[PDB]
Design a protein around this ligand. Structure first.
Ligand SMILES: *[C@@H]1O[C@H](CO)[C@@H](O)[C@H](O)[C@H]1NC(C)=O
Ligand SMILES: *[C@@H]1O[C@H](CO)[C@@H](O)[C@H](O)[C@H]1NC(C)=O
Lengths: 129, 51
């Protein structure tokens, strides 16, 4: 049993910035990778960003690679995803979801990391302009 | 030799059999130390070549 909580969403304007705080507990972040997706009304899921324990494997989706950055720390076990240069078609409920972080190792091929969300947070809110 | 006769069947000759054996071993020995290209073959995404 794990819980994820997010806060900091409010009215936003295009070209502005917003600070989003997403704390969680019940699972250590030392060996956990956090995801980010958004759920616009009437539409399917969309991938936003990915992050590893320290760095690398922080790949971003094609349409949201402009100036979006995600950072993590171990001191207080929380995550951030600051919104920047908000467009007029990127308004939706952003969701942060835990990942199991399973892997595999073959001497010839090397480390292979699999990705699939396990736990999900309550959800945030966005409103352009 | 001056005046002597002998017969032999080359198909039963073992000089050729030994030559095949050691030549095969020689090639294997030369390839022992240097790298093996096992990791290379993965899912390759190939369409065509510009040239
Ligand atoms: C390296 O490990 C320390 C351990 O406390 C952690 O605080 C730090 O964030 C790690 N490095 C990075 C780049 O996060
Ligand atoms: C063999 O040949 C030699 C010459 O090369 C000859 O002198 C001798 O008589 C021959 N022997 C036989 C058995 O034919």
């Amino acid at each position: 049993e794990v819980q994820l909580v997010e806060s900091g969403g409010n009215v936003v304007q295009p070209g502005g910035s917003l600070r989003l705080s997403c704390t969680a507990s019940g699972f250590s972040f030392d060996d956990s990778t956090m995801h980010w997706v958004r759920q616009a009304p009437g539409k399917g899921l969309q991938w936003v960003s990915l992050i590893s324990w320290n760095g690398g494997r922080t790949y971003y989706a094609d349409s949201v690679k402009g100036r979006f950055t995600i950072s993590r720390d171990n001191s207080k076990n929380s995550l951030y995803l600051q919104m920047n240069s908000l467009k007029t078609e990127d308004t939706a409920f952003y969701f942060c979801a835990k990942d199991k972080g399973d892997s595999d190792y073959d001497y010839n091929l090397g480390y292979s990391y699999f990705y699939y969300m396990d736990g999900w947070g309550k959800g945030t809110t966005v409103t352009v302009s | 030799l001056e005046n002597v006769t002998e017969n032999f069947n080359m198909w039963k000759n073992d000089m050729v059999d030994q030559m095949h054996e050691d030549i095969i071993s020689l090639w294997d020995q030369s390839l022992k130390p240097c790298v093996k290209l096992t990791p290379l073959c993965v899912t390759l995404n190939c369409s065509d070549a510009k040239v």
